Design an enzyme around this catalytic site. Structure first.
Site, PDB file in Angstrom:
ATOM      1  N   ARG A  84       0.866  -1.172  -0.178  1.00  0.00           N
ATOM      2  CA  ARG A  84      -0.098   0.119   0.122  1.00  0.00           C
ATOM      3  C   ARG A  84       0.868   1.154  -0.013  1.00  0.00           C
ATOM      4  O   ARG A  84       1.869   1.270   0.991  1.00  0.00           O
ATOM      5  CB  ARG A  84      -0.985   0.097   1.268  1.00  0.00           C
ATOM      6  CG  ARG A  84      -2.158   0.942   1.209  1.00  0.00           C
ATOM      7  CD  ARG A  84      -1.936   2.508   1.278  1.00  0.00           C
ATOM      8  NE  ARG A  84      -1.299   2.997   2.572  1.00  0.00           N
ATOM      9  CZ  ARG A  84      -1.812   3.689   3.412  1.00  0.00           C
ATOM     10  NH1 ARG A  84      -3.060   4.118   3.469  1.00  0.00           N
ATOM     11  NH2 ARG A  84      -0.902   4.191   4.338  1.00  0.00           N
TER      12      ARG A  84
ATOM     13  N   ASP B 193       1.826   4.934   0.613  1.00  0.00           N
ATOM     14  CA  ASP B 193       1.250   5.860   1.406  1.00  0.00           C
ATOM     15  C   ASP B 193       1.212   7.418   0.597  1.00  0.00           C
ATOM     16  O   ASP B 193       2.477   7.535   0.035  1.00  0.00           O
ATOM     17  CB  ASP B 193       1.905   5.973   2.741  1.00  0.00           C
ATOM     18  CG  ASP B 193       1.476   7.127   3.713  1.00  0.00           C
ATOM     19  OD1 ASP B 193       0.198   6.927   4.203  1.00  0.00           O
ATOM     20  OD2 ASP B 193       2.136   8.115   4.180  1.00  0.00           O
TER      21      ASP B 193
ATOM     22  N   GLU C 129      -2.954   5.543  -1.734  1.00  0.00           N
ATOM     23  CA  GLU C 129      -3.672   6.282  -0.974  1.00  0.00           C
ATOM     24  C   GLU C 129      -3.749   7.585  -1.573  1.00  0.00           C
ATOM     25  O   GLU C 129      -2.688   8.301  -1.530  1.00  0.00           O
ATOM     26  CB  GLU C 129      -3.567   6.300   0.228  1.00  0.00           C
ATOM     27  CG  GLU C 129      -4.756   6.931   1.204  1.00  0.00           C
ATOM     28  CD  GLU C 129      -4.573   7.485   2.508  1.00  0.00           C
ATOM     29  OE1 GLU C 129      -5.627   7.297   3.390  1.00  0.00           O
ATOM     30  OE2 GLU C 129      -3.770   8.261   2.995  1.00  0.00           O
TER      31      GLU C 129
ATOM     32  N   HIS D  12      -8.108   3.991   9.128  1.00  0.00           N
ATOM     33  CA  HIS D  12      -7.304   4.687  10.104  1.00  0.00           C
ATOM     34  C   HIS D  12      -7.501   6.181   9.915  1.00  0.00           C
ATOM     35  O   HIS D  12      -6.935   7.075  10.773  1.00  0.00           O
ATOM     36  CB  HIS D  12      -5.937   4.082  10.261  1.00  0.00           C
ATOM     37  CG  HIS D  12      -5.206   4.308   8.984  1.00  0.00           C
ATOM     38  ND1 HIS D  12      -5.775   4.179   7.629  1.00  0.00           N
ATOM     39  CD2 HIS D  12      -4.010   5.003   8.758  1.00  0.00           C
ATOM     40  CE1 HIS D  12      -4.818   4.496   6.952  1.00  0.00           C
ATOM     41  NE2 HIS D  12      -3.835   5.011   7.441  1.00  0.00           N
ATOM     42  N   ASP D  13      -7.893   6.619   8.667  1.00  0.00           N
ATOM     43  CA  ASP D  13      -7.806   8.040   8.581  1.00  0.00           C
ATOM     44  C   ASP D  13      -9.259   8.844   8.705  1.00  0.00           C
ATOM     45  O   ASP D  13      -9.452   9.903   8.590  1.00  0.00           O
ATOM     46  CB  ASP D  13      -7.440   8.547   7.224  1.00  0.00           C
ATOM     47  CG  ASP D  13      -5.963   8.583   7.039  1.00  0.00           C
ATOM     48  OD1 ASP D  13      -5.410   8.189   5.630  1.00  0.00           O
ATOM     49  OD2 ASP D  13      -4.910   8.727   7.930  1.00  0.00           O
TER      50      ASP D  13
HETATM   51  C1  LIG Z   1       1.648   9.981   6.818  1.00  0.00           C
HETATM   52  C2  LIG Z   1       0.204  10.005   7.007  1.00  0.00           C
HETATM   53  O1  LIG Z   1      -0.278   9.670   5.620  1.00  0.00           O
HETATM   54  C3  LIG Z   1      -1.418   8.877   5.298  1.00  0.00           C
HETATM   55  O2  LIG Z   1      -2.636   9.746   5.501  1.00  0.00           O
HETATM   56  C4  LIG Z   1      -2.680  11.180   4.875  1.00  0.00           C
HETATM   57  C5  LIG Z   1      -2.878  11.209   3.230  1.00  0.00           C
HETATM   58  O3  LIG Z   1      -1.839  10.591   2.526  1.00  0.00           O
HETATM   59  C6  LIG Z   1      -2.660  13.024   2.827  1.00  0.00           C
HETATM   60  O4  LIG Z   1      -3.325  12.928   1.489  1.00  0.00           O
HETATM   61  C7  LIG Z   1      -3.511  13.638   3.783  1.00  0.00           C
HETATM   62  O5  LIG Z   1      -4.962  13.348   3.591  1.00  0.00           O
HETATM   63  C8  LIG Z   1      -5.722  14.860   3.663  1.00  0.00           C
HETATM   64  C9  LIG Z   1      -6.263  15.173   2.434  1.00  0.00           C
HETATM   65  O6  LIG Z   1      -5.203  15.329   1.368  1.00  0.00           O
HETATM   66  C10 LIG Z   1      -6.790  16.250   2.520  1.00  0.00           C
HETATM   67  O7  LIG Z   1      -7.204  16.666   1.350  1.00  0.00           O
HETATM   68  C11 LIG Z   1      -8.321  15.862   3.373  1.00  0.00           C
HETATM   69  O8  LIG Z   1      -8.948  17.147   3.409  1.00  0.00           O
HETATM   70  O9  LIG Z   1      -7.869  15.640   4.634  1.00  0.00           O
HETATM   71  C12 LIG Z   1      -6.854  14.380   4.683  1.00  0.00           C
HETATM   72  C13 LIG Z   1      -6.630  13.934   6.245  1.00  0.00           C
HETATM   73  O10 LIG Z   1      -7.890  14.353   6.982  1.00  0.00           O
HETATM   74  O11 LIG Z   1      -3.307  13.606   5.197  1.00  0.00           O
HETATM   75  C14 LIG Z   1      -3.483  12.147   5.667  1.00  0.00           C
HETATM   76  C15 LIG Z   1      -3.568  12.056   7.030  1.00  0.00           C
HETATM   77  O12 LIG Z   1      -4.113  13.155   7.542  1.00  0.00           O
HETATM   78  C16 LIG Z   1      -1.842   7.823   6.289  1.00  0.00           C
HETATM   79  O13 LIG Z   1      -3.156   7.263   6.106  1.00  0.00           O
HETATM   80  C17 LIG Z   1      -1.831   8.529   7.884  1.00  0.00           C
HETATM   81  O14 LIG Z   1      -2.369   7.565   8.930  1.00  0.00           O
HETATM   82  C18 LIG Z   1      -0.400   8.922   7.959  1.00  0.00           C
HETATM   83  N1  LIG Z   1      -0.365   9.466   9.295  1.00  0.00           N
HETATM   84  C19 LIG Z   1       0.722   9.700  10.185  1.00  0.00           C
HETATM   85  C20 LIG Z   1       1.163  11.262  10.187  1.00  0.00           C
HETATM   86  C21 LIG Z   1       0.905  12.076  11.347  1.00  0.00           C
HETATM   87  C22 LIG Z   1       1.747  13.560  11.302  1.00  0.00           C
HETATM   88  O15 LIG Z   1       2.934  13.299  12.019  1.00  0.00           O
HETATM   89  C23 LIG Z   1       0.458  11.671  12.502  1.00  0.00           C
HETATM   90  O16 LIG Z   1      -0.627  12.712  13.382  1.00  0.00           O
HETATM   91  C24 LIG Z   1      -0.549  10.318  12.271  1.00  0.00           C
HETATM   92  O17 LIG Z   1      -1.063   9.719  13.283  1.00  0.00           O
HETATM   93  C25 LIG Z   1       0.244   9.404  11.666  1.00  0.00           C
HETATM   94  O18 LIG Z   1      -0.620   8.280  11.281  1.00  0.00           O
END
Ligand SMILES: C[C@H]1O[C@H](O[C@H]2[C@H](O)[C@@H](O)[C@@H](O[C@H]3[C@H](O)[C@@H](O)[C@H](O)O[C@@H]3CO)O[C@@H]2CO)[C@H](O)[C@@H](O)[C@@H]1N[C@H]1C=C(CO)[C@@H](O)[C@H](O)[C@H]1O
Ligand SMILES: C[C@H]1O[C@H](O[C@H]2[C@H](O)[C@@H](O)[C@@H](O[C@H]3[C@H](O)[C@@H](O)[C@H](O)O[C@@H]3CO)O[C@@H]2CO)[C@H](O)[C@@H](O)[C@@H]1N[C@H]1C=C(CO)[C@@H](O)[C@H](O)[C@H]1O
Ligand SMILES: C[C@H]1O[C@H](O[C@H]2[C@H](O)[C@@H](O)[C@@H](O[C@H]3[C@H](O)[C@@H](O)[C@H](O)O[C@@H]3CO)O[C@@H]2CO)[C@H](O)[C@@H](O)[C@@H]1N[C@H]1C=C(CO)[C@@H](O)[C@H](O)[C@H]1O
Ligand SMILES: [Ca+2]
Ligand SMILES: [Ca+2]
Ligand SMILES: [Ca+2]
Ligand SMILES: [Ca+2]
Lengths: 686, 686
Positions: B227, B229, B257, B327-328
């Site tokens: 997968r 990221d 993703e 998880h998101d």
């Molecule tokens: C590293 C992080 O990556 C993955 O999730 C990301 C998406 O890949 C990324 O596109 C973004 O998504 C947002 C989207 O682009 C935006 O337009 C939309 O309105 O909101 C989305 C988020 O609500 O961001 C997400 C994560 O927000 C994985 O699936 C995540 O689990 C992964 N998480 C990490 C990163 C952080 C920062 O240090 C921690 O807070 C989190 O616990 C950790 O799991």
């Protein structure tokens, strides 16, 4: 030339057909009218002649009644000279007004007109961009009794004036003499007489070639389509050699009548549209349209299941002629049935897949039961009725919108009384919504379509209570209430960049024949046509332009091929399958095999070394053979279209479920004739 | 081997994935648990390590919890060594328990286990027919501040222990130093940092090569899928040369993703799926599923529209990974919400097209909000929950019935609250009917299906109040009443005789690599595979059996090809299209053109003579190039994947809608590097 030219005799899905009973349409010339007991100008006795003719059709083309409606094809009564006798049947006198009781297939019925009058009909129909389809009924001549030679004209048949023979004293066996069908079996309906009609014997070489010479004569005179009568009641093998005769000569859209009952789904019927080389009148469409829209014996789910199912079952669904009534059914419009029912049913047929045919007088709300009551003279030529108007508005969309002519049908919304469906071809789309309930409006929520954003005006101009469609982001449309009885058609047209093939005609021909491929996106520059992986380019493409290419079938092995187009830029189209390349000119051979004994559920089949015989594949064997009428069990017989003037190899076999029993011995061999008929009479080799 | 084998790493449509957050599943080895600050054995604090490890997943494959559920694939937290820092964020301590804060892509995260425990995971899984998918996060390393070198581990990257560089004073430019992304544009979300994560710079030959070498060593440890990221936040062109590296070396199923919100449809999303060489988590599906079964902010016609629409927009819909939560986002079951919605949506996902993924703990009706509340430890290992039983009944069907695994979806009955759709592949059929209304029974009338006549058990054994279906003549089912919250699955399987392609993986690769085609009806004897008109046979079909063939890609020109199979007996299959043959191995080159001033909506584009550059077709040219962050307008820049090691000829163009303003001068030329990156920097030529 474009896919929509009147010169496109091979494909008709851009057309709307108006079916004319010549005698009941217009009497343009009274001096050709029958006299005496054969005639009734008040047309109150419907089995008599009323006097309608070819000059009367030339007149309603010319004065614009037909053209005003958007009609682009006319299907007229059989043109052939008929018997002159008035026949009494249980007190009731009857004439050949319908054109179905022939005696000379090389002359005109003079009540309709002279040869010069038929030519003038073809020429003024063509000058007005209308195609002319004739009925042709090669199953029989006329009412005859071998017992009583003075009844009617004794089924007599003439070749352009010269008597060939009658039913009594048929020493040449021009006709079948097995008695009449009880309709129990397909075999029984083929070889026995229909009612009292003198059945032609297609296995007699004189009948075979005269009938084939006669259809070539009508093709020489310029006809564009052929509706052949009682396809169920002729040998399918003879019909395929008849079809190869017109397809290798001058291919024109040919379709046949195989009647289908209310809920009858018939395998042979579908096999016949899929393999004979002619399409069929779409009785499955017709009977379900009347169950949903006329009689309310089924609902929109039934309508959906039929449109979805038929798109798979007919290999070329765009070739089937659709209709809501015709000369064998009671008129759709009843005495107490709301005119909205007729209007929607016509709108449905006009925007659906196939080639729509409209029975003369529908636009004037004619009612009437079965024959002869469904063939009354049409009562008025009023050009302002609501039904005249829905055909006027919609029939041109088949020439201008390739999605209506050639597109797939997608149901976008439905409930018991509403269906909104989408026709789509490339980027062209039409959407039509109809609410068959006349009391209850329908709340449409959540419709999405392939329409780009816009505010689409209903092509019907609100005459069937339609409305505007406001299509927002992503083809999603704003909610609306569909009026009780409402019908609306919304559409969008554009150029296609991809080649998209929507139809090919003919679908069966020998190498050297020019096939016509119609669709959009071919481009102006000569591209490539693929028969399988064989590619025709250059001079074998006789014509190329964006909507139509005409190309010679390449010298490939007989068999069936997928066709594909590539424009000059190398982009390739969708696959049009089931094209049959024939080994050559055909002849129909009777195969008789004696002493083929079979257990219950076991039947004799034939296979052989040419694609016409299945190329040695038991799954594609010719059969089940027959064993009741012309020959009885354990003799089995079958009339099979076969390559003319060739030595073919073949063997028979028995099939019971998955088990195949081949006859022992060496391969039988046979050199077919170049024209005519032949019979091979052999014995089961164990 | 057959399509459903655990050794089929290319396609996963017959699998049911179970997404495990390794830390929150099971602690099978306490001795590798973090200490004191980074750890909370009660897992009351969802941001600290709780202890869950690879040994604990081995225990759950072994004691029957996962295999008993019918799970056939497992997707686990990124296996890679993470930073050890406990980070503070507002007086709230935070650790890398999620596996997303990488330090070294070539070592394991010791809290999960050793390389030896990772081999044990691969092996116990495979031994129990479960495939292993690992998360890979190549966009970034970890929280870093260039200003403050002591924050976290300054996003330092090690190469198997050897330090490469940190974010503060990055002289060999390993990272992007443009600031953080506000998500305004795709360009901005790519080159600027996602949150505080030191964003890796893929244009640096060191990072480009290290990341490709690291993925290769996990392909070498036997992982079956990846997968990747934040696929949105890395350059398409670089991710394509990364995809070509996996697919030209050891092709396994990889998907990204690209987050997508409610009612959101991005064209760039479907362009990525269709052109990157990887597929995608199907957020389109997931968002509409939650609207209809969880949140009631849409109805069945919306679901219908999503199913119909995704089937034409996703070029290979069978490769999209579907889910209802992860998880998101908040977990699907609401606290003290109706369990039947979860059960229903789980049954919806399990029978629908794509590759279904279940978020761990769904079967235990885990509730929780957004991060970190949706990653609590699994509280029970109960095998008797109805959600457990529903997955156990339906998960197997993706291996047994090919209609579920590869079939087309076709709605057969619908209304605001009820959908019954049919999956169809050959003559294998599945029909599932769902009534989301938990109060009202539904009376189904007019259901026509493709099942044979007969009566059908609900395979769910009536646990979700489903019923027995009786089917009569022509697939018409008898009237019935779908219960409140009724979900029923009825099915029909039968062997396919004629060859049907259900899936192909990989979808993009150079000549010489072996692709996997899955379906039914291929037969036991080698036949032919066409890539265009190029028939591949014999020695190049590396394996051939009825459900799976593997074959080497022919030495054809770079381009996109249709794939078609013809079994030994000559019967040819459906066409599987959009297959890309790369001209060779790939390197991402940065193209930079200066002084390219544009007009209103005039954009600059790149095209050249290899298929990778659109082969001089303006309609296929690379672009629109970028011009804000790395280089500013009128300089335009773009990271394009190109064939490694040869002189490409290129030119740039501007496109004003349909106007192409080409550079004048002569065709430019550049010899690509064989590995690593390069940057071509040029000025517009008039
Ligand atoms: C590293 C992080 O990556 C993955 O999730 C990301 C998406 O890949 C990324 O596109 C973004 O998504 C947002 C989207 O682009 C935006 O337009 C939309 O309105 O909101 C989305 C988020 O609500 O961001 C997400 C994560 O927000 C994985 O699936 C995540 O689990 C992964 N998480 C990490 C990163 C952080 C920062 O240090 C921690 O807070 C989190 O616990 C950790 O799991
Ligand atoms: C000669 C006759 O031909 C056409 O009808 C065909 C059908 O196309 C054919 O498939 C078959 O269909 C009959 C069907 O099998 C039966 O179940 C149903 O009840 O009736 C169908 C129609 O008769 O049979 C006939 C061929 O006999 C035309 O559509 C018919 O109009 C046409 N009818 C002739 C025959 C008679 C008597 O000679 C006249 O009374 C009649 O007016 C004339 O049109
Ligand atoms: C012993 C055996 O003799 C004949 O054999 C058949 C093949 O068994 C059958 O597949 C069929 O194959 C076609 C072949 O593929 C094609 O290339 C060739 O050009 O044409 C063939 C068909 O004409 O035909 C061959 C013979 O040419 C019999 O036909 C078989 O039935 C027979 N096997 C059975 C059946 C009978 C016959 O009643 C017994 O006599 C015999 O002992 C038993 O083995
Ligand atoms: Ca007259
Ligand atoms: Ca007959
Ligand atoms: Ca541990
Ligand atoms: Ca990035």
């Amino acid at each position: 030339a474009p896919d929509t030219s009147v010169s496109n005799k091979q494909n008709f899905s851009t057309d709307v057909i108006y079916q004319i009973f010549t005698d009941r349409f217009s009497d343009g010339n009274p001096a050709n009218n029958p006299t005496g007991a054969a005639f009734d100008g008040s047309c109150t006795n419907l089995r008599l002649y009323c006097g309608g003719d070819w000059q009367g059709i030339i007149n309603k083309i010319n004065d614009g009644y037909l053209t005003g409606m958007g009609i682009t094809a006319i299907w007229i009564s059989q043109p052939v000279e008929n018997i002159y006798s008035v026949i009494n049947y249980s007190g009731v006198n009857n004439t050949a007004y319908h054109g179905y009781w022939a005696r000379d297939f090389k002359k005109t019925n003079p009540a309709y007109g002279t040869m010069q009058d038929f030519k003038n009909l073809i020429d003024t129909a063509h000058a007005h961009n209308i195609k002319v389809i004739i009925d042709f009924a090669p199953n029989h001549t006329s009412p005859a009794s071998s017992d009583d030679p003075s009844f009617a004209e004794n089924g007599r048949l003439y070749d352009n004036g010269n008597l060939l023979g009658g039913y009594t004293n048929d020493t040449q066996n021009l006709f079948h003499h097995y008695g009449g069908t009880d309709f129990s079996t397909i075999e029984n309906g083929i070889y026995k007489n229909l009612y009292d009609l003198a059945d032609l014997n297609h296995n007699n070489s004189s009948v075979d070639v005269y009938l084939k010479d006669a259809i070539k004569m009508w093709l020489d005179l310029g006809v564009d389509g052929i509706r052949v009568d009682a396809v169920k009641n002729m040998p399918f093998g003879w019909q395929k050699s008849f079809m190869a005769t017109i397809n290798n000569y001058k291919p024109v859209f040919t379709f046949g009548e195989w009647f289908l009952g209310v809920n009858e789904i018939s395998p042979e019927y579908h096999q016949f549209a899929n393999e004979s080389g002619m399409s069929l009148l779409d009785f499955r469409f017709a009977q379900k349209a009347r169950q949903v829209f006329r009689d309310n014996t089924d609902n929109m789910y039934g309508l959906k299941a039929m449109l979805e199912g038929s798109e798979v079952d007919y290999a070329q669904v765009n070739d089937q002629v659709t209709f809501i009534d015709n000369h064998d059914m009671e008129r759709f419009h009843t005495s107490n049935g709301d005119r909205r029912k007729l209007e929607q049913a016509l709108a449905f047929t006009l925007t659906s897949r196939g080639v729509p045919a409209i029975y003369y007088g529908s636009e004037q709300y004619m009612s009437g039961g079965n024959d002869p009551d469904n063939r009354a003279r049409l009562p008025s030529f009023s050009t302002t009725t609501t039904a005249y108007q829905v055909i006027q508005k919609l029939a041109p969309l088949r020439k201008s919108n390739p999605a209506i002519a050639y597109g797939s049908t997608h149901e976008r919304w439905i409930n018991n009384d509403v269906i909104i469906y989408e026709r789509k071809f490339g980027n062209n789309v039409a959407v039509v919504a109809i609410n068959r309930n006349m009391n209850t409006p329908a709340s449409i929520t959540g419709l999405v379509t392939s329409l780009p954003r816009g505010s689409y005006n209903d092509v019907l101009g609100g005459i069937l209570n339609g409305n505007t469609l406001t299509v927002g982001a992503g083809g999603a449309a704003s909610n609306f209430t569909l009026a009780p009885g409402g019908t609306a058609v919304w559409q969008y047209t554009t150029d296609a960049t991809t080649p998209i093939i929507g139809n090919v005609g003919p679908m069966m021909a020998k190498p050297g024949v020019t096939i016509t491929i119609d669709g959009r996106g071919f481009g102006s520059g000569k591209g490539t046509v693929y028969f399988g992986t064989t590619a025709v380019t250059g001079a074998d493409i006789v014509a190329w332009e964006d909507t139509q290419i005409q190309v010679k079938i390449p010298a490939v092995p007989g068999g069936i091929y997928d066709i594909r187009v590539a424009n000059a830029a190398g982009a390739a189209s969708n696959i049009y399958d089931n094209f049959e390349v024939l080994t050559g000119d055909q002849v129909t051979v009777r195969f008789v095999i004696n002493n083929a004994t079979t257990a219950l559920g076991q039947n004799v089949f034939l296979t052989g070394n040419v694609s016409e015989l299945g190329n040695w594949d038991p799954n594609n064997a010719i059969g089940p053979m027959y064993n009741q009428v012309v020959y009885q069990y354990p003799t089995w017989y079958y009339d099979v279209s076969v390559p003319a003037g060739q030595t073919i190899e073949f063997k028979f076999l028995k099939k019971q479920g998955s088990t195949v029993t081949w006859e022992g011995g060496a391969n039988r061999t046979f050199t077919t004739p170049t024209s005519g008929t032949a019979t091979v009479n052999v014995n089961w080799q164990p």
